[PDB]
Amino acid sequence: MARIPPLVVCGPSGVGKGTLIKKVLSEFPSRFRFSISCTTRNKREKETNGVDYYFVDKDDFERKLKEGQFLEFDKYANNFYGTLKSEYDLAVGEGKICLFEMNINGVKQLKESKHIQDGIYIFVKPPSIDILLGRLKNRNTEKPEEINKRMQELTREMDEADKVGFNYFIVNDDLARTYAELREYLLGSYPQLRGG
Numbered sequence: 001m002a003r004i005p006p007l008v009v010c011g012p013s014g015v016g017k018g019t020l021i022k023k024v025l026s027e028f029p030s031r032f033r034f035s036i037s038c039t040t041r042n043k044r045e046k047e048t049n050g051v052d053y054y055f056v057d058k059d060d061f062e063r064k065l066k067e068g069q070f071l072e073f074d075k076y077a078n079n080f081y082g083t084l085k086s087e088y089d090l091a092v093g094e095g096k097i098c099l100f101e102m103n104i105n106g107v108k109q110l111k112e113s114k115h116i117q118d119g120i121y122i123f124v125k126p127p128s129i130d131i132l133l134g135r136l137k138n139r140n141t142e143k144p145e146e147i148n149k150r151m152q153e154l155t156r157e158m159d160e161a162d163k164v165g166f167n168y169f170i171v172n173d174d175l176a177r178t179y180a181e182l183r184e185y186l187l188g189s190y191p192q193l194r195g196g
């Protein structure tokens with residue numbers, strides 16, 4: 001009998017999917033385990049190694065890849081990101097729903113993986129592209145090239161999301177409203193789920 005399907009959250013940079021995920025984990029902390037991805041990008045000052053990501057250098061990312069540690073990986077905006085088999089295994093051992101956050105290429109890979117039989121895939125959209133571009137611009141500290149790459153990824157992502165096979169599309173206009181919608185979708189999708 002099938003394991004409980006992982007929850008997979010995808011969307012463009014600047015859409016607020018990280019905050020939505022933190023709200024899910026806040027309401028349902030005993031029910032989900034967040035998959036801590038590896039990334040080669042620089043850690044921001046209030047991110048934490050071993051909570052948000054495992055921040056590694058590109059050499060160590062390549063070593064991990066070649067040693068067979070990843071279920072999927074991609075290059076996004078000049079850095080590498082990857083989902084560890086061990087992190088999915090920890091969720092499974094704990095009897096929890098694994099919660100992944102990954103980009104559209106990672107989604108495509110997970111859907112073809114023989115390690116995971118099914119999943120619930122959600123794409124988070126902005127209220128408008130203009131609003132999202134404005135949100136990216138409000139990141140005072142990111143370099144123009146970094147913003148540039150994230151906006152280039154946005155174009156691809158918005159173009160392809162319709163073709164990938166998401167179970168649900170949600171528009172993050174306001175966190176309270178959007179989370180109220182999201183939690184009802186999750187409760188409907190996971191009859192096993194309750195708060196706490």
Ligand SMILES: Nc1nc2c(ncn2[C@@H]2O[C@H](COP(=O)(O)O)[C@@H](O)[C@H]2O)c(=O)[nH]1
Pocket residue numbers: 010011012013037038041072073074076081082083101102103104105106107
């Ligand atoms: N394919 C893949 N994408 C990831 C992974 N972790 C984060 N990402 C994606 O990479 C993009 C950039 O993440 P950020 O640098 O903004 O944290 C986001 O779309 C994020 O969801 C991963 O393990 N695999």
